[PDB]
Structure formats: structure tokens, C-alpha cells
Design an enzyme around this catalytic site. Structure first.
Site, short mmCIF file in Angstrom:
data_model
loop_
_atom_site.label_atom_id
_atom_site.label_comp_id
_atom_site.label_asym_id
_atom_site.label_seq_id
_atom_site.Cartn_x
_atom_site.Cartn_y
_atom_site.Cartn_z
CB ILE A 176 13.22 -51.09 25.01
CG1 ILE A 176 12.40 -49.81 25.22
CG2 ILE A 176 12.86 -52.15 26.04
CD1 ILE A 176 11.04 -49.87 24.54
N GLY A 177 15.88 -52.65 23.79
CA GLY A 177 16.75 -53.84 23.69
C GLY A 177 16.85 -54.45 22.30
CG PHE B 12 6.15 -48.06 26.64
CD1 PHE B 12 5.93 -47.53 27.92
CD2 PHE B 12 7.46 -48.28 26.25
CE1 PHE B 12 7.00 -47.22 28.76
CE2 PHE B 12 8.52 -47.98 27.09
CZ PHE B 12 8.29 -47.43 28.34
CG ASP C 234 12.32 -56.80 32.19
OD1 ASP C 234 12.71 -57.60 33.06
OD2 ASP C 234 13.03 -55.94 31.63
CG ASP D 283 10.52 -67.79 25.53
OD1 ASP D 283 11.14 -68.50 26.36
OD2 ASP D 283 11.06 -66.88 24.87
CD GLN E 47 14.75 -63.29 31.09
OE1 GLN E 47 14.09 -63.84 31.99
NE2 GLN E 47 15.74 -63.90 30.44
CG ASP F 10 9.13 -62.77 22.51
OD1 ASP F 10 8.51 -63.05 21.45
OD2 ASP F 10 10.39 -62.86 22.61
#
Ligand code: WZU
Lengths: 271, 298
Positions: B11-12, B83, B87, B128, B132, B146
Site C-alpha cells: 500500500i506504501g 483496513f 485515502d 498530522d 493522506q 497515522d
């Protein structure tokens, strides 16, 4: 609920969650009977040690009290530990704490350095994972000192009841922190909820009236704690109260939050 | 160890660490797996990973992406998360011609404020909030993700890290060098995300600390000791900052009724002391259709 109305949340909800939190964080004054090879005095010596290393490395009191609370919560999960790996379990607790609380923590090797090579960097990294796995990664307690920070702000409130920008005197904080620091070294303290220990320590430096305004707790709630704390209280007054230091590079609006050490050796024994 | 977990796609990778979509192929249960290489980690479990795990344990809410487990294996730490498929930047990009329909905007904001109001009542700052970090699923839900730059604050707060929030979502009090901060930085970010949802464009796309401030000033007006007491005494405030006039909110967010423009301006108040709370935003008339009767006593 000693909080005034909050902009951001229900003062009652904020306070409940914090009280609700204290309940989901267990402690046991009688955890050293799970480890019958171990003596209560061993723990005091250890926590006295952490406080030392906290002062040198200019770590926050919150950092020290996180270490304490990781120590005593971890041992309650375990069995039949030996004196040998008390230095490792405590310095590893301080390592986790320091990483949680400080903007620029010490580095892993400093935590091994202090051990005088009785602990290796990679013993520390092994223990930190067992501690964190053992506590089910619950590393966000309200420390004893965190309640004193609450109470002191509530005590110094004005019109627009801002509980968030900290407004209180540093020397009063230092003097109550001294009494709590001594009190922690004795496992019997873990009888009393951390909220009560802090409330009870403020009471000794003030009154049942101020205590209630800042804590909520009624005389009966702290009554027994206050009685237990008496001997530690008088012993600190027999000697006089200590003075707020300035710390090198630590600003001044932050200087009370730095952990400190005096010879709290014999002082605990009178009791 | 890693038992029933088949990796399905990366995913990243990008500050959060390395994250894969995984299937519990016994169960057809899809998780997000965050992988932490302990071996290459000098200082052991990273400070940001210890803080995020403990915080998310005690932050169970529908609008916060859940931490399901923490599996230690082979000098690897694995964080297993609920999950979500997309985004909100990718969604907003995919929706830039059509627009996001205002029902979905209102719904998405409302839900974000409920997550944020949960964090703040739990004395946690996100720090934050950007598109995203807002994850959507296939059932109309949005959630905060995050918590690596997040932080528990004391009722009496203390001086916190000063390098916080990616530049476009950063509050003016942080750019001007405020000593303390708390809940209002998160609210400035959602305010920036709200306008972005409306305009299909970043509200304040700064390319430096000073350029961000200037873009803020160009839209909301150079602030003074009237709109924002203390502003002129702030470390990074300069008497030279140019003098721009606030702009009509019907032209910076054209698509937006009376109530929207109200909400956004209170979300974008210069004075951290006045900036609306998450809880109070949920009670705004903009949401009057979503929010319903409750009582109170003494
Ligand atoms: O730390 C973060 N950062 C959020 C931004 C990185 N993730 C993405 O960009 C993305 C894109 C598309 C689907 C998706 N993530 N699914 C996903 C991820 C997670 N749950 N679900 C977990 C993984 C750690 C949490 C939340 O994310």
C-alpha cells in the site's frame, strides 16, 4: 470533577475518562510475594537509583514516574525474579519512558553506560520488548506526578478558566514532589490510587479545602492515605523544604518538571 | 508467528514505514500490516511506534482506524490495523471534475469531527491531519490514521515538539513560533481539509514557512492585536508583514451555504483561544440535519 467547564470537551467526560483510565491500570503493594526471593527494600534502592540517573540526564519527573509505573506493573505479571536482573528491568523501563516523554532522549548506549556494563545495549533492547509485550503495550498511565500537575493548575485558576496553559508556582510543586518521591520508594504506596497519593501529599502542604477544590476527593477518600503518609510528611518537614534549581539548557518555565535527587536514604527508614 | 497472513499488495512506504494489504485467507479477513525492521533500528522499538501503539490501544472509536494486534517475530515488529481501501487525497483527486457531493462533504467532516472530539476528550493531539491520513471505506465511513506524530497532553499542558503538521495543514500559531499548543492545531487542519473538499484544491499551498503565513494572510487578512491578542509579541511575527484584507467567504468557498461559511471561519479563527472546538463544531447549524435533540441537568 474539580475541572471548570472546558471549551474542547465535557469537563465531566474528560475527568471520567481520566478516572476510568486509573481503573484499567492495576497496581499491587503485595506483588513482591509473587517473587519470594525479593525484599521490599530492593525496589526502593532501584527507584532511588533511577531518580539519580534521571537528574544527571535532566529527564522529566513524568519520565521517572513512567519508569516506576512500568517496573511495578511488569513485576505483577511475572514470577520468582531474582535481584540479579532488577537493574536491567528498571533501566529498560527508564529507556521506554525516556523514548515516550523526551523531545531528544538519551541514546541506547548511555542507558548501558550507567549500568557499569552489568547491562548490554542488546540486553536492554530484549527486556524493553518483554516489558512492553508483558504490559500488553499499555504505556500511557496517569503517573503520581501527572496528578500533581493537574491539581496545581486547578489551584491557580482565574476568570476564563483555561486549564491548559500552565499557571502556578514552581517552588510549591518542587516541595510536594519531594514528599511524593520519598513515598514512592515504599511499596505500601501502591495501596493508594495515584490520584489519592498526589491529593494526600498536597493536603500535607495545604488543607482538606484546597485538596477538595483541586482533586474532588472528600476527606474520607484520602483519609487513610493521609494517615499512611503522615510519617513521610513529618520527616520532610523536620529537615526543611528544598529549593527550585535552574538547569543548564533547560529553560525556566520548565525547570520544576526536571527530576531531582537528594539523599532520601535514611529519610525513608524513619517510618 | 506470522500465521494466516498472505501479503496481497504494498500500500506504501513514506515516514509511517512499510505497509501491506494482507488477507486472513482462512477467514477472508483483510488487514493493513505495518512492518518495522528491528535489526536496522539502533535505538530499538522507535519512539514514534511506542507512542502510536499505546495511544491507539486506548483510542477505540468508529472514526479512528483500529490497531488489532502487535506481533513480534524474527527481529520484525508487525502492527496489524483495520483496513480501508482508499485515502481521501486519491478520493478528492478522483472527484476533482464531478466535485464531491455536499451531502458526502458534510458527512465526512461530521465524522472527522467525531473522531477528533474523541481524541481531544481523551487528551490526545493528532498533529498530522492531512487528506493522506484520512481513510474511507465502501460504506460511507471516514477515519483518522497515522498516530506517529500524535501526543497525549497534560490537563496543565507542557511545551511540546515544535516540528509538527505538514506545511499546507499547519496552523498560524505554530508558524509564528508559539511556545505551547493543544487541540486548536487539529481544528485548523480539518478547516483546511473542509475547504479543500469544497474547492477541489489545497486552501493554502505554501512552499515555505514564510510563504505559508503569507498565503494564510492573503486570504484571512494580516492579523493584529485586535483579531488575535499576543500576535505582535510572537517570536516569528514581524511588524513588516504586508497588510491584506480578509476575503468574502462566498468567493474562497463559493459552493457553500450560510452555515458552511460560518463553520469554516470559526475553524480558521487566528486566535487558538477562540477557534471552535471539535465538540462545538458537531453542534453547529451546518450539521442541524445530522444532529438531533439531547437534554442537560445540574
Ligand atoms: O499510518 C498510516 N498512514 C496513512 C497513510 C498511509 N496509508 C495509505 O496511504 C493508504 C492508501 C490506501 C489504502 C490504505 N492506506 N489502507 C490502510 C492502511 C491502514 N489501514 N488501512 C493502516 C496502516 C497504518 C495506518 C492505518 O496508516
Amino acid at each position: 470533577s474539580p475541572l471548570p467547564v472546558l471549551s474542547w470537551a465535557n469537563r465531566e467526560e474528560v475527568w471520567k475518562i481520566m478516572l476510568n483510565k486509573e481503573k484499567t491500570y492495576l497496581r499491587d503493594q503485595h506483588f513482591l510475594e509473587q517473587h519470594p526471593l525479593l525484599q521490599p527494600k530492593m525496589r526502593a534502592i532501584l527507584l532511588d537509583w533511577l531518580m539519580e540517573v534521571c537528574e544527571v540526564y535532566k529527564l522529566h519527573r513524568e519520565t521517572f514516574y513512567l519508569a516506576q509505573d512500568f517496573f511495578d506493573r511488569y513485576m505483577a505479571t511475572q514470577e520468582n525474579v531474582v535481584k540479579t536482573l532488577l537493574q536491567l528491568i528498571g533501566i529498560s523501563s527508564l529507556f521506554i519512558a525516556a523514548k515516550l516523554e523526551e523531545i531528544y532522549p538519551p541514546k541506547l548506549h548511555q542507558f548501558a553506560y550507567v549500568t557499569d556494563g552489568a547491562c548490554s545495549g542488546d540486553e536492554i533492547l530484549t527486556m524493553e520488548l518483554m516489558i512492553m509485550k508483558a504490559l500488553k503495550w499499555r504505556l500511557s498511565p496517569l503517573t503520581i506526578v501527572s496528578w500533581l500537575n493537574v491539581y496545581m493548575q486547578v489551584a491557580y485558576l482565574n476568570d476564563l478558566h483555561e486549564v491548559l496553559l500552565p499557571q502556578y508556582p514552581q517552588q510549591i510543586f518542587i516541595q510536594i514532589a519531594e514528599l511524593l518521591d520519598l513515598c514512592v520508594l515504599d511499596v505500601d504506596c501502591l495501596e493508594f490510587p495515584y490520584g489519592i497519593l498526589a491529593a494526600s501529599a498536597l493536603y500535607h502542604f495545604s488543607s482538606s479545602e484546597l485538596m477538595q477544590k483541586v482533586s474532588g476527593y472528600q476527606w474520607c477518600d484520602i483519609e487513610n492515605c493521609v494517615k499512611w503518609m503522615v510519617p513521610f510528611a513529618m520527616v520532610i518537614r523536620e529537615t526543611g523544604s528544598s529549593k527550585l534549581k535552574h538547569f543548564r539548557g533547560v529553560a525556566d518555565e520548565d525547570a520544576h518538571n526536571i527530576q531531582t535527587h537528594r539523599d532520601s536514604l535514611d529519610l525513608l527508614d524513619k517510618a | 508467528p506470522m500465521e494466516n497472513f498472505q501479503k496481497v499488495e504494498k500500500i506504501g512506504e513514506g515516514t509511517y514505514g512499510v505497509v501491506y494489504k494482507a488477507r486472513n485467507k482462512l477467514t477472508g479477513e483483510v488487514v493493513a500490516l505495518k512492518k518495522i525492521r528491528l535489526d536496522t533500528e539502533t535505538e530499538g522499538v522507535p519512539s514514534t511506534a511506542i507512542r502510536e501503539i499505546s495511544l491507539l490501544k486506548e483510542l477505540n472509536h468508529p472514526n479512528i482506524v483500529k490497531l488489532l494486534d502487535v506481533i513480534h517475530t524474527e527481529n520484525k515488529l508487525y502492527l496489524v490495523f483495520e483496513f480501508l481501501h482508499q485515502d481521501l487525497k486519491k478520493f478528492m483527486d478522483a472527484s476533482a471534475l464531478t466535485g464531491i457531493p455536499l451531502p458526502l462533504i458534510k458527512s465526512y467532516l461530521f465524522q472527522l469531527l467525531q473522531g477528533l472530539a474523541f481524541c481531544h476528550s481523551h487528551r490526545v493531539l493528532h498533529r498530522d491531519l492531512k487528506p493522506q491520513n484520512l481513510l474511507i471505506n465502501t460504506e460511507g465511513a471516514i477515519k483518522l490514521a497515522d498516530f506517529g506524530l500524535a501526543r497525549a497532553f497534560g490537563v496543565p499542558v507542557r511545551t511540546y515538539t515544535h516540528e509538527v503538521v505538514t506545511l499546507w495543514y499547519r496552523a498560524p500559531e505554530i508558524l509564528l513560533g508559539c511556545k505551547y499548543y493543544s487541540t486548536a492545531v487539529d481544528i485548523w487542519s480539518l478547516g483546511c481539509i473542509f475547504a479543500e473538499m469544497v474547492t477541489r484544491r489545497a486552501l493554502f499551498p505554501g512552499d515555505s514557512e514564510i510563504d505559508q503565513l503569507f498565503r494564510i494572510f492573503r486570504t484571512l487578512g494580516t492579523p493584529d492585536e485586535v483579531v488575535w491578542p499576543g500576535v505582535t509579541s510572537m517570536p516569528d511575527y514581524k511588524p513588516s508583514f504586508p497588510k491584506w484584507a480578509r476575503q468574502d467567504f462566498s468567493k474562497v468557498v463559493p459552493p457553500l451555504d450560510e452555515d458552511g461559511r460560518s463553520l469554516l471561519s470559526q475553524m480558521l479563527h487566528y486566535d487558538p483561544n477562540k477557534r471552535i472546538s471539535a465538540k462545538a463544531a458537531l453542534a453547529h447549524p451546518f450539521f442541524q440535519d445530522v444532529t438531533k435533540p439531547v437534554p442537560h441537568l445540574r
